[PDB]
Ligand binder design. Sequence first.
Ligand SMILES: Nc1ncnc2c1ncn2[C@@H]1O[C@H](COP(=O)(O)OP(=O)(O)O)[C@@H](O)[C@H]1O
Ligand SMILES: [Mg+2]
Length: 332
Amino acid sequence: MPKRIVYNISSDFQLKSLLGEGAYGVVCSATHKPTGEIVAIKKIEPFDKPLFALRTLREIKILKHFKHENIITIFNIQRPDSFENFNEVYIIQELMQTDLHRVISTQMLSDDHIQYFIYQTLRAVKVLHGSNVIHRDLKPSNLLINSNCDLKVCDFGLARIIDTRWYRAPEVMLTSAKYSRAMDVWSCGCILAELFLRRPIFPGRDYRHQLLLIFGIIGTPHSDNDLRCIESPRAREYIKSLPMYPAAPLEKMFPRVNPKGIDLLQRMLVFDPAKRITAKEALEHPYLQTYHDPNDEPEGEPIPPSFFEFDHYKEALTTKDLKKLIWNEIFS
Ligand SMILES: Nc1ncnc2c1ncn2[C@@H]1O[C@H](COP(=O)(O)OP(=O)(O)O)[C@@H](O)[C@H]1O
Ligand SMILES: [Mg+2]
């Protein structure tokens, strides 16, 4: 518990350990004295840029609205004592043991575990997509895991309601990419790839490098038909200035990996977003039959765009505007 970590929270809590520290959030476990229960508290200081406040608002509205076995459970949100003093947001949630990035880099995983993790990740993506929400930042560190391997997705601040570059879909990097469910499926494929390979599959240093590593594996879109899904004719030019790589032979690349797993993986890492398998289909794929239960996979209920009506504001919301919005979401 670095001393330089201060939480203006109810004294009922005793900070125990530091679990994460970024430019947006800081997460620590903490004991709740009245019950003895250990929890996790995500502290956010969102009022220096509108971007951080928008991210904060989207994240708590999502966490307060969604209830699903594979979505992190929120217990409550600290109640600020006054509006003037309100400068930090403290989200109190169920404590999880670790996250998938930590497991992947510290554990050898059996096939059964890889199947179960990717399965739960897809089950969460399905309910979000069914509710017309795309996460947009799916990666192993945002997949929380506890001892019995239950997985729960977290970090919902970048979500959007429809209509790290290492896990980003190519379409997102070639143009003013439209938000689509397919970009989450692409990240899911990068995560499945990482589970098999035991390290990230496309660790690009920059945008150029990233595309280089990507086509290296899936094949360079050659024919016009392939590039017709790319809006910016210049973007198409860029692609053509690339080597014409052939789709790598994954069975030979991952000789110790379950073939069905390989098959599912190639249906996810497809250049053309429209040709990418959907979350729902992926749950129905043979690789996951041990876990698939079409009567236990919530389809979701549509959320209107007005749920984040502020994402469409013409004259960009002021920080004070955003502060009242966050405050009202906390007290409701
Ligand atoms: N509920 C939780 N239980 C245990 N660890 C957590 C929990 N929430 C977050 N963490 C840890 O904190 C890290 C960062 O949290 P995250 O919510 O993704 O915030 P950030 O926006 O900073 O990435 C995670 O990668 C994980 O290791
Ligand atoms: Mg995160």
